[model samples]
Target: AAESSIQVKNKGSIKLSNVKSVVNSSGKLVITSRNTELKLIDEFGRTKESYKVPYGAVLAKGDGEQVAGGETVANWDPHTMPVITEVSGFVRFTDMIDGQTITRQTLSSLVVLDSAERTAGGKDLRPALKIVDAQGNDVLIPGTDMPAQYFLPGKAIVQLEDGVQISSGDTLARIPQE
Candidate 1:
């Protein structure tokens, strides 16, 4: 059997050039090697920059008008044309509004998420985090039986407390919003 190995500290970083770094559905950064077939963007601003995947976005329509505090956003589908993060700066969108594309940029310091109400299917709104594995093949775990899904072995967990250290992708806490 042939096995490969590369070890490093938990506080280390890896650098890759010409690769696109995107945020996982759970808001974790996934480093992927790729070609320049698609444009790469870095920052999200009035400037029409390249595609940085997770940190930035591109679409026909988006509205960052509402994103309340204590509100979770880890389950938003990228296909939906909406920005869900309170990033207070300014955002100017250039897409079809009503019928025609409008001008002028909208600026603010916060980019918030959506306040989802009950869906047409009569289901309450909530969030779901995706696996952050490199293979990107992981699926929703929980075996889905109502009992299996919610009934984990009784155990305590650390929380999203103040002044504590946390890296990207680490759950601030298994919040109730989920």
Candidate 2:
């Protein structure tokens, strides 16, 4: 006898709510939501996994809590602590200064240096967004630039010079222009 397989398709439009994580046939994990509890389902849409993600915890699509922080890390045991990686940086200001904005820039350019785990030396670090003026002076923003990006064990949203948004996963800033 030969092995048989079953294929399930959406005969009718089925709306799913509170879906958190999903594991495909290849064992790849995919997260549908972050900062909320979720229910895992199998191929037939049966509940296979269910759990509550602590506030601020980021459940990346197709992966287990990639970046855990905020209140979640406060209660995590040191031995099991998830590594906090430096993702990216952004030049944030109260408002865009007139005649100071770069005319053109891209979203996939490196504007900051990215640190690697092997090079991080096991210390908590965040992406540093440095905004230098025409005179080579650092424009410091109170309570902002330092730790420009942070999330509870997951990815953080970053905006580039070109006004394009992206999620940086332990990568450096891709600020293409000034």
Candidate 3:
């Protein structure tokens, strides 16, 4: 036996699915699936991370508010440094004469101090620069980098020129060059 009634609100067509005890009655739709198939159709393709995480599904790691003078760049908490793209220094200078007194000087490689090499008088004088490493082995100052790093406070002061590690206990840079 069956009973039915209809008003057909804006009738288009009727559809039925998974008739679980919903025999021509019981205005109820019970949908419980142990396994289901979802054929995703993409009008536009999407991208996902290696972990299969979606871009829009990412959570904010920090505040998005701005401070008066503090850093506000998203995820750019630490600012970058400018490269030593170029470097120039004054090694020596020419002694221009003001009658008897010297006037101006120029950047000439001439020995500014003759006594530095030719100790014409007092104690043997030579430019001395001592750099001792007590770190025992490879020293990793501040941190270590490609294209190298700019200036990172106490971070980029030293860079490894050897291999993955830097040599220690060698006063190579301090060694006087003649």
Candidate 4:
């Protein structure tokens, strides 16, 4: 009796050679090899979305509008993507708002709410946040008279005062009425 080896080629340009015989268990083909090279290739035979960090990569941690990479990692805008850090993990938009800095350890809790409200008539009323001004008087902004979507985080739908409907992320600012 004589022994023979077989070779198999895949669409991905991978070749398996010197196979004494092939056996399958649990939908996988087991092979014996002295060594193997594991390569992740894309459809075009190129690597995609992969990077190798050196043994000692310089990583910094900070809290602000900008990240360590000189990019706007955080912003007051709620729709902005959150910046993630190893030390603090995922950082929220509020972390960089008000020009204040917060660390992961210092921040105990974080909450985000959609403030826009709608009326029965289907009008979007401007959402308001009550805050004390320098005069100690309570003030509403994007004000009660303005459209609801004027709030800082402007991605929510709101009801208008006159029973008109308005959506968030419309005009940059309130449109002046004549």
Candidate 5:
């Protein structure tokens, strides 16, 4: 009936440590900071136990945001990848050529279908979104020349319709919890 929370005590300035987001041995969402003391608080803030720094969690707060001590940094939620938009534009589902439902039951590492039309020098295709901004330019994900995500149906369910206007950081889809 209780859950753990990643909390940090009040420090002058608190920043999340630069650690790659990966699933820990407990399979829990890890939120860590390089500096300051980190704590895993229980429900109602009764248990203020400490968590190791530099590897601790968020869809709520990113690594970029700063929090002072006494302020909780992040919390855990059911496993799901919220496809947050990186740019404000019109959305397009350009690569849903076939309909496939991938769930938790069938766990395998195989590409059953290929959706890449431009396969010459392009990477393997998965689900993705093409957002055209005001200037009619295609908005690529942060550092990639590709769309927002490799959306997997049943895995990541899209909430918006095709050609819908969107804002930066808006949730487009989410990988549903099993």
Candidate 6:
């Protein structure tokens, strides 16, 4: 049997952590799982500035999910995009959403609560995380117009922690893959 492989097109080695994948209602693949700081290290062992796939991408080729040169990073649908900060600010607060605590605990395990589950039973979605600009004013969600309030979207993880300063374009949380 001849099996075709998806080769890695990018240079250097790649490590896959927090791997998340989902199929949307439209029958398309969406990978909004764990966020990794793609750091490039040279042969001498020095690290370069980390890189990010602003939009989540599905990755292939795994020896337990770590890719070297024979893997492929595939693009995914954007509807399940992570909560990305639009302005330079620090996380002000994250309240409970869907009756679940939006704390560091959300980041440790695979605790995901979808809307269907909530409709069946749980807390209704409410304002979860808030960000304040450097001058201490509320920052609004990029195109949401309203203040940057992120209601828990099912399988989300709170990435904003106390004292964590974030620049514009920084990711706020992950809508993890099961």
What are the per-residue Cα lDDT tens digits for candidate 3 across 72-100?
Answer: 11111122221121111111111211222
When sorted by TM-score, best at the front, the candidate numbers are 5, 6, 2, 1, 4, 3
The CA lDDT at 64 in model 6 is 29
Task: For residues 65-165, write the lDDT of model 5, one tens digit per residue.
Answer: 44455666555344544555555688776554433322122323212233333343233445566777766677776657775543554345555666878
For each candidate, what TM-score against the reference? 0.17, 0.23, 0.12, 0.17, 0.47, 0.43
Candidate 4 local lDDT, residue 45: 54
Best by TM-score: 5
Q: Highest lDDT: which candidate?
A: 6
Q: Candidate 3 versus the native: TM-score?
A: 0.12
Model 1 / residue 139 / CA error / Å:
7.3
lDDT of 4 by residue, 1-178 (tens): 0111111122222222232111222221222222322222345655322222111111121111112222221112222221111111111121122112211111232122223322332233323322233443433323255311123233321121222222211212221111
For candidate 2, write residues 74-167 as lDDT tens digits: 1111222222222222333322222222112244332222333213331243343343344534444333665332221212223334222222
Give me the displacement of residue 29 in model 3, in angstroms.
72
Candidate with more favorable, higher lDDT: 2 or 5: 5
The true-versus-predicted C-alpha distance at residue 159 of model 6, in Å, is 3.3
Identify the runs in model 1 with alpha carbons over 4 angstroms from their true place: 1-116, 122-126, 139-169, 172-178
Scored by lDDT, model 6 comes in at: 0.49
Kindly report which residue stretches of model 6 are placed more than 4 angstroms away from their true locations once superposed. Answer: 1-81, 97-122, 125-127, 141-145
RMSD of each: 21.8, 15.7, 29.3, 24.1, 10.1, 12.4
